[PDB]
């Protein structure tokens, strides 16, 4: 059993205690503070509120519980238990907290508001801040749907480049990530994080999350095809590498299939193996059902290089319009072994430089794609910036002295379209003065319950590239 | 509910048709892979073999839902319903499935096997590698609790040198990361590998982990102390930031508070206000209630050093009998912002060459100790070592011509004390030949049932360092 209580750092159980007297109103926000990923994804919000948030999340039993731990924690009663024991019996565990947030899916420029937090008691001006800690985690799911997405906009530049339209894109880049993620919950909120932007994946947790906190008009939303790991390969022993790809391939004969194909000699599988050995039971295969070739080990850009030189040599390779060279349709490379941001721009660069379509290669990203983000990256923060004492509003910010990348916000905050179009967040108050039309934040939680949701499928055309917007 | 029938990577469920006809036996293997990080803290794989692996893990119903969602999935039937329809009327849905490990907490060099992997019937041969993806997350509880055990070796060597001992050591770096990792589930199993290390977090989810999972003689693992956090200084308004320190050090004056002193201007709240201003009510406190300042913005290094040079001339410094500054027993100092294992280096080598003892200074880290890791720090990989097939048993391996570094283990493994006392990895079965003494993997699963397992405290003393010893 989940318990709110004691779901926050422990130094916080002992703020209500620090703010000054009669203070009756905390406001706080988040932000992916500006400091190269000039615009972020907002995604996950959702997720949180339901799973954590939501309903009756107090009781009797929690509130005991939290003091018999803070307890032994603190050497010290600190707890706030009375504070606790009125959310319960005032308002039947639910939480008095009103949460605003831009629509998920949204891609706004860093340094705007994307939401806000306040208590709708007096009583609960601590709570406000309580929380900050479970609302921060949707640092992770945003990070991952940009970056996720940042990989997209490389992509889609050089598919277009290279082949005169975006086919397939939102197949070109597939989650691997499962393995190499810190949890089981991880791995589902950064895999439904992944599927913002494309429909790849082999992280099968991240299907059900969908399915629970958002939805789709598809039955799932994401894909993978058969294929091979090491050990389907090795078992066979040394000496029958081609009788392990003979075997794979005839059972997978009208379907795709990948199959890694570095486990001796990756060069000489394509060469020898697949280009002369099982040539006839590759030529033969429906387009609809191509041999995907995965090397995995050596430099990823010269061996991707080199493994299409070699595949050029035995198979039929055509000109595309683009003039790019293109493998025939049964045929195609995904690269999986260390693919991150940078390393994508890396190999498709060099692809186009040697004259190969980004048509022939998909890949496969794990670690880079899930495990290796921080809350650093795009400087996902949560701030108090607007408080209420002896009935005065104050607006309220940190500003340090040898950080100005550190100032917050202050005051009121609302987020509007300027003239151009474009976003801003207004402080103090002044989207008050309704000079810059209505604010766009909407309110999805209060006082316990969901009050405004979102489709995966709207999730997906908010987070669309202007490119596929064109198109 | 959780369903280990959609837990593993999607091609893992075609495995079951691609390995050698007629196979009975796939044994796997677990190892921090050779290429500093040069030895490994073995710990995490008794919580996921309680909450995932043991007992009734597959039911009609969760065979359904995976046929259902797999079709979807690959737009085709190809899901091995027949394989974990067996396993639920033969096994009563418990895994037939051994796994032997070396003891949590034991810190082993690179290269070894840590754990392995077998099927225990002949039917599910295609289990082992399913429960790939879920076994080797481990990574991450290892890979924690090993980068935070070197971080103890750097405070230790530190401490040591400029106090001539280690009191405190176990509270000199605090688990900060709470926010700053991926989920909550993470934020549990994080802050618990740190644990094994230190006794201080504030990841609160760490404690509800190891009492269910590991146990302690102990109440609780982990510890904190009240501190403010810069919403309850900057609330009071930023002309009244003096107010805010008062208020807070007046509320927790019998107990240790830590005081966030950089929302407007760390040099004046240091040398104005908790050394002018305030200096009353800091120098009147205990020493089992220190009031902590903490920085948290600037360049950590020369921050830290600045502060320290700022209250030396405020309060009374003593030199120890090591010949290192020592601010009164009240005052100490906790830097939390950008401490990672490479910065806390930088910082305390800093201290020492500036002659201040690292008894001043406790550490703070968030993303740094809990999500700034991978997987390919220590190369935490699984791998098929040996397989039956025929009856025949035979030791396969992959071995990369572009990369000797993936060369993976052949074999039936072993792991062995030396004659000098040190760690062997023996392939091939050749633990058998009884040469090396006892193997020291543990059975610690067989079919649904944890077999073996270890208190948290025991973990603790497996991981204890030399100089602890
Ligand atoms: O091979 C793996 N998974 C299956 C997979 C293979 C290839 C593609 S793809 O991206 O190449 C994909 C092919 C199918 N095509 C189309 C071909 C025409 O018909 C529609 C699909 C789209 C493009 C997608 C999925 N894995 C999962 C891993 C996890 C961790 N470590 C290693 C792993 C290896
Ligand atoms: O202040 C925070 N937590 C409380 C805390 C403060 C200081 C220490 S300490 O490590 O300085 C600790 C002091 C008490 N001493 C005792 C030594 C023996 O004598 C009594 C004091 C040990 C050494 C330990 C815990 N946080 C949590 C955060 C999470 C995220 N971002 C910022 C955060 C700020």
Same mark, same amino acid.
């Given at each position: +059993?989940?318990?709110?209580?004691?779901?926050?750092?422990?130094?916080?159980? *002992?703020?209500?205690?620090?703010?000054?007297?009669?203070?009756?109103?905390?406001?706080?926000?988040?932000?992916?503070?500006?400091?190269?990923?000039?615009?972020?994804?907002?995604?996950?919000?959702?997720?949180?509120?339901?799973?954590?948030?939501?309903?009756?999340?107090?009781?009797?039993?929690?509130?005991?519980? @939290?003091? /018999?731990?803070?307890?032994?924690?603190?050497? /010290?009663?600190?707890?706030? +238990?009375?504070?606790?024991? #009125?959310?319960?019996?005032?308002?039947?565990?639910?939480?008095?907290?009103?949460?605003?947030?831009?629509?998920?899916?949204?891609?706004?420029? =860093?340094?705007?508001?994307?939401? *806000?937090?306040?208590?709708?008691?007096?009583?609960?001006?601590?709570?406000?801040?309580?929380?900050?800690?479970?609302?921060?985690?949707?640092?992770?799911?945003?990070?991952? @749907?940009?970056?996720? =997405?940042?990989?997209?906009?490389?992509?889609?530049?050089?598919?277009?480049?290279?082949? $005169?339209?975006?086919?397939?894109?939102?197949?070109?880049?597939?989650?691997?990530?499962?393995?190499?993620?810190?949890?089981?919950?991880?791995?589902?909120?950064?895999?439904?994080?992944?599927?913002?932007?494309?429909?790849?994946?082999?992280?099968? @947790?991240?299907?059900?999350?969908?399915?629970?906190?958002?939805?789709?008009? /598809?039955?799932?939303?994401?894909?993978?095809?058969?294929?091979?790991?090491?050990?389907?390969?090795? @078992?066979?022993?040394?000496?029958?590498?081609?009788?392990?790809?003979?075997?794979?391939?005839?059972?997978?004969?009208?379907?795709?299939?990948?199959?890694?194909?570095?486990?001796? /000699?990756? #060069?000489?599988?394509?060469?020898?193996?697949?280009?002369?050995?099982?040539?006839?039971?590759?030529?033969?295969?429906?387009?609809?059902?191509?041999?995907?070739?995965?090397?995995?080990?050596?430099?990823?850009?010269?061996?991707?290089?080199?493994?299409?030189?070699?595949?050029?040599?035995?198979?039929?390779?055509?000109?595309?319009?683009?003039?790019?060279?293109?493998?025939?349709?049964?045929?195609?490379?995904?690269?999986?072994?260390?693919?991150?941001?940078?390393?994508?721009?890396?190999?498709?660069?060099?692809?186009?430089?040697?004259?190969?379509?980004?048509?022939?290669?998909?890949?496969?990203?794990?670690?880079?794609?899930?495990?290796?983000?921080?809350?650093?990256?795009?400087?996902?923060?949560?701030?108090?910036?607007?408080?209420?004492?002896?009935?005065?509003?104050?607006?309220?910010?940190?500003?340090?002295?040898?950080?100005?990348?550190? =100032?917050?916000?202050?005051?009121?905050?609302?987020?509007?379209?300027?003239?151009? $179009?474009?976003?801003?967040?207004?402080?103090?108050?002044? $989207?008050?003065?309704?000079?810059?039309?209505?604010?766009?934040?909407?309110?999805?939680?209060?006082?316990?319950?969901?009050?405004?949701?979102?489709?995966?499928?709207?999730?997906?055309?908010?987070?669309?590239?202007?490119?596929?917007?064109?198109?």
């Amino acid at each position: +059993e989940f318990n709110i209580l004691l779901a926050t750092d422990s130094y916080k159980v *002992t703020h209500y205690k620090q703010y000054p007297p009669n203070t009756s109103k905390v406001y706080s926000y988040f932000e992916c503070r500006e400091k190269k990923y000039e615009e972020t994804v907002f995604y996950g919000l959702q997720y949180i509120l339901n799973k954590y948030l939501k309903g009756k999340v107090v009781t009797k039993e929690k509130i005991q519980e @939290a003091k /018999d731990v803070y307890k032994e924690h603190f050497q /010290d009663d600190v707890f706030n +238990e009375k504070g606790w024991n #009125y959310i319960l019996e005032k308002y039947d565990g639910h939480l008095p907290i009103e949460i605003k947030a831009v629509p998920e899916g949204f891609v706004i420029p =860093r340094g705007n508001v994307l939401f *806000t937090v306040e208590n709708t008691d007096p009583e609960c001006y601590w709570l406000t801040n309580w929380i900050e800690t479970i609302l921060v985690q949707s640092w992770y799911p945003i990070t991952v @749907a940009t970056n996720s =997405r940042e990989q997209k906009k490389i992509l889609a530049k050089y598919l277009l480049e290279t082949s $005169g339209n975006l086919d397939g894109l939102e197949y070109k880049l597939h989650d691997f990530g499962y393995r190499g993620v810190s949890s089981q919950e991880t791995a589902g909120i950064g895999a439904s994080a992944h599927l913002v932007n494309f429909k790849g994946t082999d992280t099968v @947790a991240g299907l059900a999350l969908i399915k629970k906190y958002y939805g789709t008009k /598809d039955p799932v939303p994401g894909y993978s095809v058969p294929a091979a790991e090491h050990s389907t390969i090795t @078992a066979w022993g040394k000496d029958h590498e081609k009788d392990a790809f003979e075997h794979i391939v005839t059972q997978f004969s009208s379907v795709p299939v990948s199959v890694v194909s570095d486990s001796y /000699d990756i #060069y000489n599988a394509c060469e020898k193996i697949w280009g002369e050995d099982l040539r006839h039971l590759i030529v033969s295969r429906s387009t609809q059902a191509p041999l995907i070739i995965r090397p995995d080990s050596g430099n990823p850009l010269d061996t991707v290089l080199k493994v299409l030189e070699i595949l050029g040599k035995k198979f039929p390779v055509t000109e595309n319009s683009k003039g790019y060279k293109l493998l025939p349709p049964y045929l195609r490379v995904i690269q999986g072994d260390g693919v991150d941001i940078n390393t994508l721009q890396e190999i498709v660069e060099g692809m186009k430089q040697k004259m190969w379509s980004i048509e022939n290669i998909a890949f496969g990203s794990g670690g880079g794609l899930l495990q290796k983000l921080t809350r650093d990256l795009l400087n996902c923060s949560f701030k108090c910036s607007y408080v209420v004492t002896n009935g005065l509003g104050i607006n309220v910010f940190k500003d340090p002295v040898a950080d100005p990348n550190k =100032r917050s916000k202050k005051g009121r905050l609302s987020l509007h379209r300027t003239p151009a $179009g474009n976003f801003v967040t207004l402080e103090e108050g002044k $989207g008050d003065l309704e000079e810059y039309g209505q604010d766009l934040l909407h309110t999805v939680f209060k006082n316990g319950k969901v009050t405004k949701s979102y489709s995966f499928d709207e999730i997906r055309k908010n987070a669309q590239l202007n490119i596929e917007l064109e198109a």
